[PDB]
Nucleic acid binder design. Sequence first.
RNA 1: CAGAGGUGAAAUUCUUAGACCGCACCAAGACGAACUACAGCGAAGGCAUUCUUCAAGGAUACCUUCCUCAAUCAAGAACCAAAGUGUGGAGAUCGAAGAUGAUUAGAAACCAUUGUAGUCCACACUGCAAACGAUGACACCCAUGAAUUGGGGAUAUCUUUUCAGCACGUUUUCUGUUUUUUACGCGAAAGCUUUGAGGUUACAGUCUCAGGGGGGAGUACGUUCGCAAGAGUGAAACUUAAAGAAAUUGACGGAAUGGCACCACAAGACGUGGAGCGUGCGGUUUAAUUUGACCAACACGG
Lengths: 65, 48, 225, 136, 33, 103
Amino acid sequence: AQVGLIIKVLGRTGSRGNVTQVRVRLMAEAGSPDYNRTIVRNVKGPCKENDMLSLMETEREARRL
Amino acid sequence: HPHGGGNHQHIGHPSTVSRHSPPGQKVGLIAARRTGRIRGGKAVKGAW
Amino acid sequence: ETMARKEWYDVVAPANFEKRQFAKTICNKTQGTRIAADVLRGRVFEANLADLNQSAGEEEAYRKVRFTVQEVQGRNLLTQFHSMEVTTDKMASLLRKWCTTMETTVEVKTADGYTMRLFVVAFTKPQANQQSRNCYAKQRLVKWLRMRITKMIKRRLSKVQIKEAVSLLTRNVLSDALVRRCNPILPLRELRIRKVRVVRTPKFDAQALLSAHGTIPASVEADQR
Amino acid sequence: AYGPNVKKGDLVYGVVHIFASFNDTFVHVTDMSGRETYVKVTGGMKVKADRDESSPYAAMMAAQDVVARCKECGINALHVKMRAVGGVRTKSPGPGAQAALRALARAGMKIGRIEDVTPIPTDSTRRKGSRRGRRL
Amino acid sequence: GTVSRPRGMRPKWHKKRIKRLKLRRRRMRQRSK
Amino acid sequence: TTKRRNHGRSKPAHSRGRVKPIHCFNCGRLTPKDKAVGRFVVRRMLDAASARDVAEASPVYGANFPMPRLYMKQRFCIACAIHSRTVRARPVGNRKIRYTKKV
RNA sequence: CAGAGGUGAAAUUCUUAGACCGCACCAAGACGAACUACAGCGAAGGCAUUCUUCAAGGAUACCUUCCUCAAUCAAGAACCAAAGUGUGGAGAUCGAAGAUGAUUAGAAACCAUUGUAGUCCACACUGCAAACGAUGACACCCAUGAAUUGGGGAUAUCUUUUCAGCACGUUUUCUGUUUUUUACGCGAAAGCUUUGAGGUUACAGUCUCAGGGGGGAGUACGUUCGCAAGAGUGAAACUUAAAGAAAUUGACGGAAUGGCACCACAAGACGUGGAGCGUGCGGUUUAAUUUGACCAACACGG
Ligand SMILES: [K+]
Ligand SMILES: [Mg+2]
Ligand SMILES: [Mg+2]
Ligand SMILES: [Mg+2]
Ligand SMILES: [Mg+2]
Ligand SMILES: [Mg+2]
Ligand SMILES: [Mg+2]
Ligand SMILES: [Mg+2]
Ligand SMILES: [Mg+2]
Ligand SMILES: [Mg+2]
Ligand SMILES: [Mg+2]
Ligand SMILES: [Mg+2]
Ligand SMILES: [Mg+2]
Ligand SMILES: [Mg+2]
Ligand SMILES: [Mg+2]
Ligand SMILES: [Mg+2]
Ligand SMILES: [Mg+2]
Ligand SMILES: [Mg+2]
Ligand SMILES: [Mg+2]
Ligand SMILES: [Mg+2]
Ligand SMILES: [Mg+2]
Ligand SMILES: [Mg+2]
Ligand SMILES: [Mg+2]
Ligand SMILES: [Mg+2]
Ligand SMILES: [Mg+2]
Ligand SMILES: [Mg+2]
Ligand SMILES: [Mg+2]
C-alpha cells in the first residue's frame, strides 16, 4: 500500500464530476526507486491538495483526459 | 446403357460415379469433385 | 520443457564490422535427421549498424544490416551480408511537403557475383536566397540526376568485391560521392541510400567465406559451464 | 538453468514483437533472426471478456508473463518492434502498445532499439467496405 | 439533405416504376402481336 | 445556393477533370484526394510518463538519443473529419480563413 | 503453443487437425503510399513507380514562309466515367443477387463473416451521369495586391568532375496557363467581377442550342437505332393555384461552443410506489349521487 501525497489537483474529470484527477507524489524513503516519483491518478470523494492516498497499484497511470 | 429406360427420359440415379466403378458402370460424370456452373474462378482441371 | 532441446549459437558478422560476435540464437538439438546445421543455414539476422560499429556516429543508428548464415562452424554462425536498410522512423521523417522526392533503383553485380539493388532516394532543397513557395524540380533534371546516380553506382560497385562494396555502403563513402557529384545538377537537401539488398548470390564458396571472416573469434557455448 | 554460457550480468538480447490491434495485443519474444520464439503471450490469454482483450491492463499482464518466461530462458534485454494492423487497414497502434512496452521496462527488462514496423503498402488493394465506407 | 423537395416521392424510384411499367406493356403487346 | 466558392475541394473549374479517390482513414469512404481532409501527424511512440520509464531502462535511449516517433499522413472523409473534431462548422465569415502551416 | 478473429456487446467464422503470431521466402492479380499542392497535362471522358521506345500537342522564340485560307453551325460523323451486354482471358482484393450471425415490434437494411455476377485485360456493343463551373463557342475593353506553372529578355546567393560554356536561385520585365485576397458595375439575393454573372430599357460584335405555371410525362402511339437493357424523337386527354428561387426572423436538431438549476444529475438522506385508513379524481350505481380543473388537474376551487 504505497502512500502518495497530492501536490496539485488537475480538475474534475468524468461526466458527473464526482471523480477528480490529481497529481500524486509518492512518499517513499530516501534512495528508494520510487523516491520523488509523480503520477496522475483519479480520486473518488472529496480530495484537496496536500491530502494523502493509499495506492494499491502504482504501475497504472490515469489518462490525462 | 445405365441411363436407358423409364417412361420419362431421365437418369434415375446420380450421374456422378465413383473412380472405382467397373467398366460398363463408369458412365456419366466420372469421379467428379463438383457439379453445376462452376461459378467463380475456374480451378485448374486434372490431378494434383 | 521446450528449452531443454535448445542449443545456443553465436552469430558472427564478417571482418569489416567492428563487433564480430553480435547477437545470440537458439536451435533444436539435432534430434536425428533434423540436423541443426542443415536448418540453421539461410537464417537472416537483423542488427543495427550502430551496434556493429561502436565507433560509428549518430547517422549509423538509423541503418539496419541483415546477415545470412552461410555456414555453421561449431557454435559460430558465420554470415554474409544480406541487406541494409534505413529505419522506418528516419525515412518517414525525411519527407517534406513542398519539394519533390526523387527515387532511383540501381542493380549492379560485383566481382564475386552478388547482384544487388540499391534504392537511392533524394530530396530537393530551397536555396538560401530562395523565397519561392515550392522547390519542385524539372523532370529533365530529375532524369539527369537519376542517370548520374545510376552510372556512378554501376561504375564504382562493379569493380570491387562484396566485402568492399559492403564497406562502401556502411561507411557512407559511396553516398558522399553521390551527393557531391549530384548537387551541381540539382540543389539536394539530402541524398541517401534507402535500402540495399542482395538479390542474387554466386555458388557457395567457403574459402571465400573464411577469407571474408578473417580471424574467427571462438565461441564458448559448447564449453563446460 | 537455461541461457547462453555468458558472464553473469551480460546483456542477452531478444526481439519483442508488440502487435497492438484494436481487438487484441500480442507480446511475442523471438531471437534476432525471428525464426525461434521464446514466448508469445496475448492480451486475450489474460482476460475472459472479448472486449477486454485489447485493454491496456491486459497488455500489462501479458508483458509481465513474458518477462517471467524470458527470465527463465536467459533473455534480459529486448529490442522492440511495434506494429499496427497495417496493410490496407488502420495504421494507428492499439491501446495496449504503450502498456506492454512500459510493463516490460518496469519489470526489469532492458530495452534496446525501438522501431515501428507496421506494414506500409506503397500501393494497396481495395480496402474492406463499400465506397460509402462503414456506416454507423 | 443536399436537395430540395422531391414533391411526391423520390423521382429516381418513380422513374424505375415507370420503366418497369413500360417493360410490362411491351411484353403484353408482344404477346398480342 | 452555393455554400463554397471552391465547392469544398481544391479543383478549379479548368484545372483537372478527375482526382483519384482515396479511402478515409477511419471508415474507408472513397473521397477525392483534394477534397479529403489531410493532416500530417507526428505522434510520439510513448507518452511522456511511459517514455521516462523506457528511457530509464534503455541503454540506447536517453537525454542524448531521442526515441522514434510515428509519422502518418491521415486523410479523412468529411463526415469522419467532423465527427473526430478535426474540423468543425464555422461562422460564414470565418469559413474563408485558411492555414498553410501546422500551427 | 491455445486461443485467434470480429463487435456497442456478441455470434455466424477459423483453431492442438497448430489457428493467430514471428522470419525469410514464393505465386498471382490489382495498385502505384508518403512526396500529392485552391499544382501539371488532356477536346471532354480522363491521366501518377523507373527505363527504353512510337507518333504527336501546346506554349515560347523568330526582321522564316503564305496572304483571308476564317468564326459558328440544321443534316451528317467521331470520341465518351461507372454500371450494363457479347466473345475470349483473368480472378489477388473488394463485392449487386444470395446465405448466415447479430440488432429490431417487425428488419427482406445499416454492423459482422461470407458470397455470385461484376471489379482487371483484349476485341466488339451500349452512348442514359450532379458527363457541373449546374455558367455554349469566338472576338474587344476592364481597377488593385500577393503568389503559382511553362518559355523567353536584362542584370545577389549556392553547388560546380560530367546528358554541363551547368543547374538552381535574386531583382525587374514579358507571352501563355490553372488560381487567390481585397474597384467600378451587375444581380431578386446568395453572389460574379480582366477567370464576369460587368461594359443591356442609355436595350444591336458574330454564330448556335435550349425554355415559356405545376403535373399527367419524357408517359401513349408511330417511327429510327440497339443483342438486350434501353436510346433518340415525342403528345394528348385529364388535373391543378400554386410549384419554385434567394434571403429574414423564429422554432426545432438523436449538430457544435460556453455557461447554469437539487421543480436536473452526481454523493447521499428521508420517503412515495407494497398494508390499513383519511381525503380528492375517475369509473360504476343512483331520483340525484350538482359542478370547474386532466409539468401548469386530483387535502385544488381557501
Ligand atoms: K433411366
Ligand atoms: Mg444396366
Ligand atoms: Mg425430356
Ligand atoms: Mg431428362
Ligand atoms: Mg517551382
Ligand atoms: Mg478475440
Ligand atoms: Mg453517423
Ligand atoms: Mg443540411
Ligand atoms: Mg441546403
Ligand atoms: Mg430546384
Ligand atoms: Mg489545362
Ligand atoms: Mg468529373
Ligand atoms: Mg476540403
Ligand atoms: Mg505452422
Ligand atoms: Mg510514388
Ligand atoms: Mg465496366
Ligand atoms: Mg465483361
Ligand atoms: Mg463458350
Ligand atoms: Mg471479404
Ligand atoms: Mg441528359
Ligand atoms: Mg447542364
Ligand atoms: Mg505548364
Ligand atoms: Mg479577380
Ligand atoms: Mg424513350
Ligand atoms: Mg449548485
Ligand atoms: Mg416549470
Ligand atoms: Mg392541490
